[PDB]
Design a protein around this ligand. Structure first.
Ligand code: HEM
Ligand SMILES: Cc1ccc(S(=O)(=O)N(C)c2ccnn2-c2ccccc2)cc1
Length: 462
């Protein structure tokens, strides 16, 4: 049946001159207007079928789930991850790592001390670190990145760290630097451009270094976890993992397999959560009435005394619509993470051969013009009915959908709820600039939309 149409394949180096590296998503849309929902693009002689719009995206990711459940190959990760872990693994190895991870990352999947409990504990430490800024102007980047990294640590090693902890610092930096240096609009760039490896050998050297620091950091906590292991009472990810390695015969589960899975979790759950939080505060600065209506709902449903908790979310339709609207507005991963077909598939009246790269435009869904009238305008009303009640949307897909859908989806959502309610409970946000002169436009560095730099003061309220 042949591959889908698209910007006529220029011999050798594909469509680079036709793409805007600064906003690749904007180009996929400029192409959908002229070729429809499903089209093909070239980076080299390697094709990439783009799925644009909810219909094409849901059909592929959902209805044709296992057919698209593959991950595109990346040389730098193939070296570091060795085809293991969760994010870039495939088939058997992936199937097993993902299911174990979904089972272990449930709110009450690692003992009596739940995930919510670990998040609440962290949200308390967060408020303190903000209070230590003495209400003086500051850039929240550093501390809004410490909190999510700590949530992950407690979930994995059953232990959090101090923001002044030397080791923890090197780790956050290593995790940031690696996403910052690897940051590119399309991840397949690396596999479609080998000469890039010869022009800049140092890039990969730094990546491997950080990757190995991250590995050793994780490996150390693992060796000492083995000694204190209680087979009947697993307190974290490692513990459950170390137990799966015993009386259960699985060669897929080894110490190395664990280290790589934990790196993936850190890598996938730190920067994304952090950036969303940074972007959250910024949007609350840009739209202070929203920040005030959240504070109103917080005072009314939680009060000024106790720490917020997940039960509150159901009773806080407005705050929830705010969190949904932030995730939807920022479009954290415009083009999702790259997929690939696992078998030859007939996508409608097209033919897609096993291994072909796939790219789903989440921006097309999240910003659907009909599902969200005025999709480029930030408005909590998108997730609120006429009675002020929370209103779900099939188009709310910031975490993707299908067999590959984010695995830390619950843990991230709990983080955004607890952290944002706790901050607006104890603080008022003050900007040096007035709202109309504040830039909120995203600069898509890599596969992650990052918010412009900014400072503010956290004014304690009591
Ligand atoms: C606001 C925060 C987050 C957002 C917006 C986000 C979103 C996403 C998206 C869009 C994907 C790709 C899905 C696909 O392949 O189609 C993804 C995958 C994944 N995320 Fe997240 N994520 C966030 C946080 C987390 C957290 C906190 C963790 C871990 C504790 C995590 C773990 C991962 C992993 C491991 C995958 C790969 C799953 C697989 O390939 O089967 N994420 N996430
Ligand atoms: C959801 C998600 C998965 C994977 C990545 S990544 O940039 O490919 N990666 C796993 C990552 C993020 C931070 N560090 N790393 C990393 C760690 C070790 C080696 C290579 C990359 C980013 C986001």
């Amino acid at each position: 049946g042949k591959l889908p149409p698209g910007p006529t394949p220029f011999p050798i180096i594909g469509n680079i001159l036709q793409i805007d590296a600064k906003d690749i998503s904007k180009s996929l849309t400029k192409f959908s207007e002229c070729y429809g929902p499903v089209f093909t693009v070239y980076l080299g002689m390697k094709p990439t079928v783009v799925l644009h719009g909810y219909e094409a995206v849901k059909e592929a990711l959902v209805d044709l789930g296992e057919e698209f459940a593959g991950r595109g190959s990346v040389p730098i990760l193939e070296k570091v991850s060795k085809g293991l872990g969760i994010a870039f693994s495939n088939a058997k190895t992936w199937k097993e790592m993902r299911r174990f991870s979904l089972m272990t990352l449930r709110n009450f999947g690692m003992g009596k001390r739940s995930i919510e409990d670990r998040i609440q504990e962290e949200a308390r430490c967060l408020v303190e670190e903000l209070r230590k800024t003495n209400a003086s102007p500051c850039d929240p980047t550093f501390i809004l990145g410490c909190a999510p990294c700590n949530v992950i640590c407690s979930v994995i090693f059953h232990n959090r760290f101090d923001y002044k902890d030397e080791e923890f610092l090197k780790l956050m930096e290593s995790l940031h630097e690696n996403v910052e240096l690897l940051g590119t609009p399309w991840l397949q760039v690396y596999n479609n451009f080998p000469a890039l490896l010869d022009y800049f050998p140092g890039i990969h050297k730094t990546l491997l270094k950080n990757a190995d620091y991250i590995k050793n950091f994780i490996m150390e906590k693992v060796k000492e976890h083995q000694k204190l292991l209680d087979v009947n009472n697993p307190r974290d990810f490692i513990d459950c993992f170390l137990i799966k390695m015993e009386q259960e015969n699985n060669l897929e589960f080894t110490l190395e397999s664990l280290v790589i899975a934990v790196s993936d979790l850190f890598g996938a759950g730190t920067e994304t959560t952090s950036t969303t939080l940074r972007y959250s505060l910024l949007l609350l600065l840009k739209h202070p009435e929203v920040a005030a209506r959240v504070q109103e709902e917080i005072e009314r449903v939680i009060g000024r005394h106790r720490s917020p908790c997940m039960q509150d979310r159901s009773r806080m339709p407005y705050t929830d619509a705010v969190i949904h609207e932030i995730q939807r507005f920022i479009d954290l991963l415009p083009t999702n993470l790259p997929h690939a077909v696992t078998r030859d598939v007939r996508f409608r009246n097209y033919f897609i051969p096993k291994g072909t790269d796939i790219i789903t435009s989440l921006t097309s869904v999240l910003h659907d013009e009909k599902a969200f009238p005025n999709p480029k305008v930030f408005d909590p009303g998108h997730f609120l009915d006429e009675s002020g009640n929370f209103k779900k949307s099939d188009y709310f897909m910031p975490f993707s959908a299908g067999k590959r859908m984010c695995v830390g989806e619950g843990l991230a959502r709990m983080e955004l709820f607890l952290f944002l309610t706790s901050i607006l409970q104890n603080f008022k946000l003050q900007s040096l600039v007035e709202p109309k002169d504040l830039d909120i436009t995203a600069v898509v560095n890599g596969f992650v939309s990052v918010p412009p730099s900014y400072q503010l003061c956290f004014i304690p309220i009591h």
